[PDB]
Amino acid sequence: MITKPDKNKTRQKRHRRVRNKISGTAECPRLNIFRSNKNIYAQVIDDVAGVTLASASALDKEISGGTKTETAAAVGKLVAERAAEKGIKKVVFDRGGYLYHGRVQALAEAARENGLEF
Amino acid sequence: LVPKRVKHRREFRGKMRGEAKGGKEVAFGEWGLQATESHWITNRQIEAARIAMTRYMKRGGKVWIKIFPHKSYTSKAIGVRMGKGKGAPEGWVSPVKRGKIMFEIAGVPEEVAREALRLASHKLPVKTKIVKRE
Amino acid sequence: MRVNITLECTSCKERNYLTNKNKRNNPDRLEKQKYCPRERKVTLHRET
Amino acid sequence: SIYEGDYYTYKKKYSENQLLREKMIIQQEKEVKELATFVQKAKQASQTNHALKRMGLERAIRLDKKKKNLTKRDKVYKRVKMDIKPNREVARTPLKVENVTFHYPGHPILYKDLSFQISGKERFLVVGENGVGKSTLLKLLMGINIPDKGKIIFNDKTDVAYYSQELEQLDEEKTILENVKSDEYTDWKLRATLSNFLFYDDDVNKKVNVLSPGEKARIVLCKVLLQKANLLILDQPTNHLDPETQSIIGANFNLFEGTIIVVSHNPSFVEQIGINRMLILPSGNIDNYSPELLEYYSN
Amino acid sequence: SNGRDSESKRLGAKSADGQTVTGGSILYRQRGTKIYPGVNVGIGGDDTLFAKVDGVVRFERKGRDKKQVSVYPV
Amino acid sequence: NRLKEKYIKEVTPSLVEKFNYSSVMQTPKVDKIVINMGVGDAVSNAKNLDKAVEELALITGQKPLITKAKKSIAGFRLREGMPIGAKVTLRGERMYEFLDKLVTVSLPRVRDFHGVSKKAFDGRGNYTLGIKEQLIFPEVDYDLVDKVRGMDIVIVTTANTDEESRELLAQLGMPFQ
Amino acid sequence: MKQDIHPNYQPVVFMDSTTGFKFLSGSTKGSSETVEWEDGNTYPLLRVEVTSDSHPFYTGRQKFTQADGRVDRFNKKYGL
RNA sequence: UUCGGAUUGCAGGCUGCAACUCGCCUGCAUGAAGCCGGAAUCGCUAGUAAUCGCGGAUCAGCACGCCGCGGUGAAUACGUUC
RNA sequence: GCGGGGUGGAGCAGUCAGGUAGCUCGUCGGGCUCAUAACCCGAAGGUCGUAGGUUCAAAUCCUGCCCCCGCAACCA
RNA sequence: GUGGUGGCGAUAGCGAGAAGGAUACACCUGUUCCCAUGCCGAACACAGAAGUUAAGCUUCUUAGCGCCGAUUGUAGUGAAGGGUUUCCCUUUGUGAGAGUAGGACGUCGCCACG
RNA sequence: GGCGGUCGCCUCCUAAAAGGUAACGGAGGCGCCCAAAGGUUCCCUCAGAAUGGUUGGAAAUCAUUCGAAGAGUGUAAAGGCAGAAGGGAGCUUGACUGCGAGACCUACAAGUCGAGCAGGGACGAAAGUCGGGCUUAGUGAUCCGGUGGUUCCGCAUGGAA
RNA sequence: UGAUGGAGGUAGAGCACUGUUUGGACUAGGGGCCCAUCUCGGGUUACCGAAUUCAGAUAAACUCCGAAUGCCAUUCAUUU
Ligand SMILES: [K+]
Ligand SMILES: [K+]
Ligand SMILES: [K+]
Ligand SMILES: [K+]
Ligand SMILES: [K+]
Ligand SMILES: [K+]
Ligand SMILES: [K+]
Ligand SMILES: [K+]
Ligand SMILES: [K+]
Ligand SMILES: [K+]
Ligand SMILES: [Mg+2]
Ligand SMILES: [Mg+2]
Ligand SMILES: [Mg+2]
Ligand SMILES: [Mg+2]
Ligand SMILES: [Mg+2]
Ligand SMILES: [Mg+2]
Ligand SMILES: [Mg+2]
Ligand SMILES: [Mg+2]
Ligand SMILES: [Mg+2]
């Protein structure tokens, strides 16, 4: 007998605490990240209206695919340029409760280079 | 009867307004002695009533004391002027409100129960009435 | 023995800060990087 | 404090001053006790005795003023306490030296075919003059120097403790407590002995690099004591020690229940230890100890 | 012996619900977070709630068992 | 890898049949093994713990974590934070290697060995083994030891019950009484 | 696994010297003897007096007489 | 400790109607205290002390005791205050 | 309520100023003596009233609590 | 449908039971890589897609627990009086807690893949 | 009146659901501590209980399960905090300088909170947080002196005093 | 004065926390007796009983709850 906690639940406990000081507005939307075993997802979210303004993911059929780190960089670029079409420049990065180390960092760095300001 | 320990050595006398909060029905025994006036009951009075009941019952049946002297009270000795802090604790009282069943009995025929509770009532500073459990 | 001390600026020697330390836990002179209002820059400050 | 005269005059003047100070503090305590005793008598009297209660408060004021002008007696500086005991027992032949020759590469041979044999619970003095080989011989026994010729055999019952002349057994970088750290002793045991050597409380966390030569000598001695060896190879032990600590060192060694190989140019220290046999250098001469030591010194 | 007590600290609400206050106005003095700082409201070093802007004070619920003060400019 | 090899090829198909497991993921496996040496003697002398830790490392091959008292106790002369106790957690291959040596080398060297207990289950399918003395492990050298000490070996498994854990451990090799 | 904090640990082969049984494992122990192993490799060889394949409990086969019943001891000494 | 040989396990040998309480001896195993003994105290002046064995009485059996026997074989006595 | 005290069988130190538990008489065992006393030699007898703290470590410092003893507990 | 991400006091929970994986989410397979464990690739991190729905997770059933909870009555009490006045009573307004009828196994959005 | 007690500060009850509110009313604390027990970034979740387990005992360490707080929060109590204010780790010194709209408290003197602005920074990828510590005690006016700094004054003038 | 919106934990009430407390059931453990004593394992007073649970009380310094009033406020209404 041994129970291994759900990693999503453990992450979401950290996410709530990240979100106590990070929240999206119309002029500074939240850049929320969801990371799976296979994929990574990005959403630009306005928490005041509770609506997502732009979105990209490794499932978009426009990302060539490869190492999960370099698909995160591909997602970061794609969400940044989709957000640019809607006039989004400034955002606050919501790391989703993940450590800002690897795939998430690759997505975040790719978003900075493609026009998002954060 | 005395509490083994108390959080505070000294306590307000308090007030006794209204009917008893709880313990207004016979709960364990067949007959109860209900207080019809409110009054402090001392642990000495509780004991006198208890012995008056049990003895007449001739160690027969069961007796429940439904009140406990939770509250302490102090006094000052003769020759002591007013002031200089609250007096030392002197005794223990249960504040009893009208409608509280002070005692219950069971295991004895009604004739003995009615006379048993009569003898106890004469030991208490409160007027009382016999109450049959419902 | 907790005591009150002054932290002097090692550059200009202005006695810039009032603080305190336990001498038993900090036998040596407390050294801190503190802003010197005279030089208007962060400088090494040492107990004098 | 600066006196005119010599060491004895300083001791005479100082001892008298501390005596006269001690008597002053005694009389000030008596007067405080007197007031205190009356204050208590009034304090416990009946509340109906108004005058005594009044006098009690008046004397309480004098008692307070007394206790605030009452000189504190300076705490007399504590002297070292040494209790050196061997864990095991000495043999009739603790150390065997046979036909041992040694020379420092490029220098004349210090001794040739040196052969001696210690007896056990013996005070063995290695006499000589400066630069004659005394410290070389002791280094030879421990193993620092490998003999050019001969053999040095220690009985399996012999545990050896070495006190080097130049205090080369301490880590200057580490603290006092770190130096004395041993696998055989727990923390509170180490602190208790260091307090016996006048290292009190956080004085043991001081770096050895900031201590004086005399305080370092105590740490080395403490290392020797903590070994509980039955053979003590001591090279000028009283060096750097204050005169009071020297007498303590000599007296305690005298009672040591083990063999002592000692070197000392201090005439007082050797007398206290009560040497049995003296080994003269460079002319090897295993001799019974006596005032003939002076004869060898003259010659 | 007894006979001691600290000076009272005048804690509690200092601005009313529906009242217009200037920025920096103290809304609530308290030990601990008996009431939480809401929109446009900050909490001081001793838990005092103060307005960050000019607006109307509203004491609101924070979920099930907590309260909250906010300031809403007009 | 030998014991891991045995587990994947032999143990797994059998346990599925015995307990009628619909999916292979139900098969109990050894999650981790925690060897714990409770050394209260560190109070009297700190080095006894130091020598204990050295031997513990050689037995497992991992530097142990020195556990510390979470609470002060005057009866044991124990202060909160004092380093009493050491543990090692073995996972993956290092776990299987150790379990193999324990089954095939260590246990036979136990003085008058008549098997390991069969009631030593926590009720949840975790078995803990109390080694009375060292020197059963070949790494101890039988001469370095000054104070003979034992250890608590906790085998943690994913079995939901004692019965499955008992079976899993038996087929992996366990001289149950 | 952290570097330079753990004791040296290498794959090794234990041998039961009572029967020569050998198996592959890992250990921190060293020895002055090495042997070749199937699959084309060489590992240090450690000598073990008793293993699970030579221990009386595991094997079940004893090597003594299980003592002598005193009734049997009495009858043997006197032939009754 | 290759000192010491207590204690214990097992196996035997004898005497005896019988050796559990209570015998002596043997083999194997086991291998205790003890590192020369505090205050105090004993014997002995030569073939003695010291040490080494041997025989005998009692006695089925059973002594480290007792009685006797020979072998080897010393040290010291100034002196009579205590 | 104001003080003083709890350490071996008893009486005392050590307590201020933290490190290591003793002294006096007594008790027990053995000596010496015809015997007893005196005397000699050995041994025993307390983790410091008790429970928490402070500290590396307390008999010691801090705090409480229970015991024992001298006072007081009301004045014109 | 599933996966993200929110608002609303748990009427959103908990326990028990049932079903599902196409995708997706997970277990899962590894320590070469960045990075990591006061020991341990368990975790964190990274790389991966053999197996598995067993668990998590989603959907469904259950009120057993937790939560929500009207009405009536009562306690208390503002105001106005009264008596036999430490207490008690009348009138007028207000009105609990308790205990209950009941409600409830959520609702309202946005995005992505189907 | 005396004797005893008290004298400033903090927390509670009294105190009558804003605030305030007396008694020689009922209870406790303070005259500090911390170089991290401060800042920040990241991470973590407790006390107990059951069961199993060498030394090991009611109870020292280990494992699983249960466990919403029954722990902890340096120090009294109250209020608060496990989206931590509790716990660990890296780097740090914001326990910054000049200030300060506006408030609270208040006889006065004082006391309390404070967004925000500038200078120069710490941590962080960034958002951002940081002008000590879960909050509220840990303090003392002026006069007179000490020490450091100073583009101030300097009794005819330059100095000095 | 009315309406509206808020802060605040008192009266009452309750026990969900903390103290105080009654009875019942059951009980680890706790006292003596015998058998067995290496003090090792039992069988009992309807012997004492933790904790648990069932029922029932109690509180200035207890609270899962909680009024009436009072209080603060509103570019509000009416009179003043
Ligand atoms: K009556
Ligand atoms: K016999
Ligand atoms: K003898
Ligand atoms: K015979
Ligand atoms: K993994
Ligand atoms: K599943
Ligand atoms: K529900
Ligand atoms: K930190
Ligand atoms: K309750
Ligand atoms: K109340
Ligand atoms: Mg020399
Ligand atoms: Mg107050
Ligand atoms: Mg502050
Ligand atoms: Mg010998
Ligand atoms: Mg003669
Ligand atoms: Mg002869
Ligand atoms: Mg209701
Ligand atoms: Mg009020
Ligand atoms: Mg109020």
Ligand SMILES: [Mg+2]
């Ligand atoms: Mg803190």
Ligand SMILES: [Mg+2]
């Ligand atoms: Mg001039």
Ligand SMILES: [Mg+2]
């Ligand atoms: Mg002039």
Ligand SMILES: [Mg+2]
């Ligand atoms: Mg009430």
Ligand SMILES: [Zn+2]
């Ligand atoms: Zn400067």
